[PDB]
Here is the input.
Amino acid sequence: AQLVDSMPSASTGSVVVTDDLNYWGGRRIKSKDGATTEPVFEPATGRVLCQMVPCGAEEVDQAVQSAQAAYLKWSKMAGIERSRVMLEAARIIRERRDNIAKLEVINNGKTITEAEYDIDAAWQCIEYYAGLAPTLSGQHIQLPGGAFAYTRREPLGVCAGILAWNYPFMIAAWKCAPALACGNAVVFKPSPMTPVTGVILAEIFHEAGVPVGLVNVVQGGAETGSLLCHHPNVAKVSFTGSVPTGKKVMEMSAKTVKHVTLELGGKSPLLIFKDCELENAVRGALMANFLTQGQVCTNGTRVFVQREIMPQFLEEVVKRTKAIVVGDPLLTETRMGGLISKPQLDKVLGFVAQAKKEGARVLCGGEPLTPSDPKLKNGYFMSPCVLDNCRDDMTCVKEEIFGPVMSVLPFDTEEEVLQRANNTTFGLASGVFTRDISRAHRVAANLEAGTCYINTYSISPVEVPFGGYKMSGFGRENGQATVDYYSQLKTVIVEMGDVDSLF
Amino acid sequence: AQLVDSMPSASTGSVVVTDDLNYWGGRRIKSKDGATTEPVFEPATGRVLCQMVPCGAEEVDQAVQSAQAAYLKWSKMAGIERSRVMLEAARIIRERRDNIAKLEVINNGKTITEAEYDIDAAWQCIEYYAGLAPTLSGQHIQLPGGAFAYTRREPLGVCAGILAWNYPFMIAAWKCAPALACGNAVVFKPSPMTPVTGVILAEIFHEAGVPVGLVNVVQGGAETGSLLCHHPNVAKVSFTGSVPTGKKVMEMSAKTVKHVTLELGGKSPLLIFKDCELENAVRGALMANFLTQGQVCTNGTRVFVQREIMPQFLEEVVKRTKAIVVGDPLLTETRMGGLISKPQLDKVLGFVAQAKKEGARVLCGGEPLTPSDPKLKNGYFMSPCVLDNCRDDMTCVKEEIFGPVMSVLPFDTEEEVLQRANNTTFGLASGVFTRDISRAHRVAANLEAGTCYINTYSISPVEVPFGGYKMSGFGRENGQATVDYYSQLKTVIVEMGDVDSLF
Amino acid sequence: AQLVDSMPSASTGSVVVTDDLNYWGGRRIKSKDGATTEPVFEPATGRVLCQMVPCGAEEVDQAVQSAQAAYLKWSKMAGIERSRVMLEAARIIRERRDNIAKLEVINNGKTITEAEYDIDAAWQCIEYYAGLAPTLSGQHIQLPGGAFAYTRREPLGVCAGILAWNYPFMIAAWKCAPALACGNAVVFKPSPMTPVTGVILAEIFHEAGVPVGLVNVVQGGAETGSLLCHHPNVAKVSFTGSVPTGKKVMEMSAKTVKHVTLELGGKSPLLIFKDCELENAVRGALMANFLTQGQVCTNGTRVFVQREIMPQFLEEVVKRTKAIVVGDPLLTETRMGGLISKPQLDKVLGFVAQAKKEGARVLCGGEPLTPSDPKLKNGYFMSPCVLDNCRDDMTCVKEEIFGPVMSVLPFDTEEEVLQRANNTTFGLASGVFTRDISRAHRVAANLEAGTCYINTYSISPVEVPFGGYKMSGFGRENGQATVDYYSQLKTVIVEMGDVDSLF
Amino acid sequence: AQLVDSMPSASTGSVVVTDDLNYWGGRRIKSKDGATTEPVFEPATGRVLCQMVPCGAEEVDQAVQSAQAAYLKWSKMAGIERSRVMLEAARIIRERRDNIAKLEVINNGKTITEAEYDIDAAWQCIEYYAGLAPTLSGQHIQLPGGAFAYTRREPLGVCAGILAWNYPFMIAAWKCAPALACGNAVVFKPSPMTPVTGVILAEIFHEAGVPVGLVNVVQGGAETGSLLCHHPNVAKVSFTGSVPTGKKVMEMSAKTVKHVTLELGGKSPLLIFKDCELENAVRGALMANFLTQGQVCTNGTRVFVQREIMPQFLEEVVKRTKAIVVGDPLLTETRMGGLISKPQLDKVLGFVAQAKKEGARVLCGGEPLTPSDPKLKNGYFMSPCVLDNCRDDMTCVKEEIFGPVMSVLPFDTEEEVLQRANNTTFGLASGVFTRDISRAHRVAANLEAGTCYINTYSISPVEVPFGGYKMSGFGRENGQATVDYYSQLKTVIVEMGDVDSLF
Here is the structure.
């Protein structure tokens, strides 16, 4: 909190975290004793911001019990009532938008120009579900012979959220917002690489007036996350991360019959037809590939450009990608920070390497970097890369890189690309730049993904649902649809007369 | 089909099945070669109705491929269009109500008095979802700055249903009805003990005008059901059965990220307050315990009666249970047939046995039986049993028996029973007989089950949703809610102007 | 009914009606005594099909009382139950599709090619609302401090429908379908020019199994219609006709605070941009102007064509309009029958006359006609007319003609036409033929009408709502929206504890 | 505004209004020149608070034009965007809750104990619809043969509200809240007796950030209100007042085909069964009759008590009514202020007078009053009256008094009272105090009113809809239902292929 207020004077390479990162029972837990720890880094400098001590069964359980208690109280409040508290929680995040954004940058690495949006996105989500709580309802149906039935929309109990690192504050908000609006209690575990901003949100909810313990936070990784999935008092698990893990999470959740939702990854296709408007199309390809160091799950990393315009398109886009400013993330003119960790950087580079080993032709970027500024010497920087000469069978076209690497591929006919676009086990997003009313919707209707952008890309409004198809997951975040994943319907049938018995 | 037309003259112990029970590609498959088989029995006589040859990977796959093809066509039809075919499929079942009902009895064992309802229930479900297909829709929202978004409600693909034996024709209908209304293709596997009536439904849909292959049927058990869960072209699994299995099904489904819904079992509580109306209450307890040989998942097998009325209640109910006619199921005055199999009978009896070994006091029934009629000598009959002197810790009060065995237990205060009622890992149904407006809803609101009957029991209207809480499963069957389990929403966001790019 | 069965051999100029046209209490009323009458004509021949005796207060009242009785019973049935009867009523209309269609032609005048669609449209509407009845519901909301509320969706009572003549059977169906699906009783008054097919529908509902008296029919005009609006036992009036009358109907309805819905007329604009596809655009203009002798309220009678394509468009469309076959309506190759009455014909011609007197330039049609066939000598025929050289101030561009008269006008820019298109007191429909995704929706969003077709026209699906804007009326027919105009919500709030009193 | 800030020291008989009461174009209009005026009074003292100059065509029109302009801008903002402004408008009313409440008392006359609730009710309504704006949407349906349709939920235009005096600030809020949430512009006319607090709300919206002119206010009466109904640029009229006027308003609205909603009066019945809980029942009768000097439209002024308990009920309730403190409204221990005007007081007394002249038996109250405090000597006070010995035919049982007068009547059987309860031309509200689950809902289902309270009364939550039945009006305020009265659906059908033309 004070660290958040210190931000106005904070700058790259200067900050250092010192608070405790575990939070339950309405306060930060000291987590005493040795307890193996992990270093969390400042992506732009490679500096160690602090250590993070992971939670074991003992801790986790307390977190849960804490939530459990609070739920009992919070679930008794009416929507109109849970609404008030939430509206305030937002108003607060609103008033600390910047400071929080700035801190978000230091641990995550994305540019503040982005970070700021990330947070507005966070408080809007809350303010949205808040206004949606008084709407929560069930039905009343008149049945044959005077009897009638009615459903009650009830909360699930204690909801566990397992977060990812590309949008720390935003994703946590996206899971708590609907969860609480519905009357549930929450316990979430931020990515060990980005444990700091999460707890902030938690404190804010308490500060807003939430019953002590409603929002808890446990730090840690695999071991921890597992404890959450196995804990018998968690009614729901909301996971966001890689497909491989999503698969494990779902399995463990089965042992208890837990409700589950998975927003896994993707290798989404962007389709460019010759009748489009190059500039907007260039922007799309661009916006669809390099936000947050290209570490965005919904990125159209597999760009299909209709052969006729391949040249002029590929020209302007290589220029534009080279014109991207890599450097201090806390700078407003910077357009790309460092990746999340060294391992990730090496992994992303390793991909570009094998790309050319498979025939790929690198038009720009794809190599380590070293900013002029001396303090960024140890940052995890690389230059945005644009591949050319790609084949549907190349590892880079098939695998989710999760780095700033764009694969451009030519195509000739509509029927052609559709079969190629949908030819993946993934199905998160997709896009299309064209001008013909029919082709637009038609292609939209035919792509097998959960989201399809038409003449734009990477927009993620709170008013609409968001989730995957196929192995990109199921369930939704944002939009009204979501409330059904954090509530259940009890059917109450009421006989107005006498029982019809066969005995 | 002809077997269905032969029914008017059919009678207990006379029939014998001879058709092939596997169905895909729009016809019955001969399933040649030895291929280990299983005997399906006529519960009322112990006779072997026929053998059933289970499907292996080869067969299953063909089933799926068949569905797969048909889906492509059926999913292209509009709701209003899929509606027409379905309305006819019902009209047909309607016109063969009896014959089908009669055959249902022979393999299942329940009395025709019940069987008939089971089928009306089947065609109503179809006729309901049919009228609901033209309603299937998504949203259109206006977004900031001229852009707008819209969701399309799309079918899942190929839906696999794994059925149970207590309501063969009804449950299959309950899974296909919504599935098809939504544009999906179906492949279901009836319980190996009751493979016959299922395929009938399948043929009817084809006869109604469904694209060849839309509804397929594969016979078999564990091995088979597994193949369905692992098959890469099945988008959804809809399971109904025991908790133990539900758990395995969910695990296998995870390997592919399949959509899943489980309508598992239960040990639901029936609450009787002293201010109720004994007769109706007696009927409830009765209706809540002995339909279909008491092999009903939603049965209030754990009856709590408020101490003051314990005597007079327990008196009239023991008399009534003894007054139940056990015999030929195809007889209209019969009120209980034989159980599904010998093993089940021995299992149900074994429970009563250990009950008294734990202190239970048998007031009636609980032993094998032997009807006067000579042809029913080998049937699987036992007499409806009513336990007395039960404790919350006795195995019979905790375990789902799935036989005609009622456990009566006394209670004193409201707060008392609630804690006791909800003290289970189950949460399917529950009931309450009282007269005070406040207690009714209040108790309703507090029970932790998916369904709560007030002054009645065992009613299951199509207009309302039905499913479990906790480990009784998740997802719903019937009611509007269900459509969300057989459809998904694709978000299509459309930019009306130019892209806002940070590059 | 028998007259309906006689149709297979019926032919233009041969038929003659002889049944009684008033219907209530579940049978046709003899309407004895002189009682001034009106001749109903066969538009294609000018022959008198029969006389029609109008209802006075006495009769009307009986109709109402009849409905009133039946409602009491019908409103007690559950949706699922009202559904069954309706599904049958359709199945019947389905099975007499042709014969009914044929008879529809004889009194109305439209070609059977159209008539047939009109009827399928009728039974689909019923079959649609039928499947929608089991869906009818209210809400259940949890309120602060334990209390809860719930709404019941209840029928209105006795609904009065006042029909128009351009689609006799279809419009009556469109009013009864939702009315009954909701539990209401209906009393409608067909247009005195087309009283015959209406009563047919009525009988069918009875034949389907509707409670005696639920659907009644009273013949007559102004006087009669008024009695309906003033009658104290009619809860709702559903009017379709001219604006002038809609206005009177609404006034009379006020004296009792009756629910009202008005589907008045219109002078809807069709917009053709230079980037469209001429053929489809020509078809649109065509389909938007000459169905049912151009006596369609939703016709885009004010066609705006972007200047560049004005010539080639105007050429092909004048040719096509001249290629329309006017003659025997009961002939399949006929594309236009005679108008509804002599007065209407003279009125439509009078408009074309004054058109040229104001500067209009007639490119074709616009004059009386006389088919070769001798029996059609006295029919009410005229040739489809296409005006050219029109001004926004000409009477023909401003007034609803309600005859086959198309006004083509040039335009230059988008902003231009929008201001011109929306510059009317009307607001029923509108259309736009263009190819640019943005312009399409954008223009759609900006037109001030209740319906907007994009690259087509005159389609009226049952799945979606239909009604006007401005002075074209309010309320909707078809689609789910409608149910809210035939039902009301009672709020039932239930206190679970004690009253909070300030006394 | 400053007057609002002066309130902390304000006291009965001290204040005096001096601001201008007309408001449009975002500021208070000086309304110069003589222009006949009307005195607005302080009910508790009879003092003249100020004069009110009514608006003529000239003024009104400017108001409208003002709204008209602002609408153009406000309607272009997205729900999420209109939401922000509204949330603030509330937060403001929230922060001035008291001062506003206090001022409300001075002109209206109700006690501050009530006034305070009135205002919380006002800001909640806004905060509710605000959170509901981002939810505003239409549908997307897939049609036969590739085509698809979609509806846009669009604002109406300029909405006119004609208010009543019993809840000045609350009712204005109840009309603006939904109106704006939907994108409309508003112009309302407060009751000439209570013109002051209205404009406050208006200013607040502007202060919140609403486009200049979106919320306007014109003072005046009949003449003025008429101008609103006739004005050609008002798309909707939302009226609240007497039945007689509601009827005139609807007639004038017809001349333009304006959308209309009427929340007229009522003579609602309260039913007390012998199995109830007297105390709560007494409170109900009480709360249902004497809030805001009994000048509440939803009051159960016609109390039916089951004969057996008539005595003990009637005893405790006469005592309680006598125990009501009449005096200074700005006092917290006061439970009833003075009525709205002298004429109203004389009218209410005149009713009690004729009551006894018809046989009524006055058990208490019913006469003028004169508080001890000297400053209240000229107030419009009378004592709460409780009639006894009433007949269904007495003028007092049939007419809406709109004063603190309770008519108690005995009854014997359920079927009896229902016929008697529903035997009225009114149908706004009704209540029932009983304990039997079946009777409760059953009676609820059978009463013919728009609202039915069960074991409580006068609760009016924002989460649920509120409106009348029969001649008590139509349309709803509060709850989700309302949004449909401030928005309309445009159907946009889009052809994906070629036109099917018959020419």
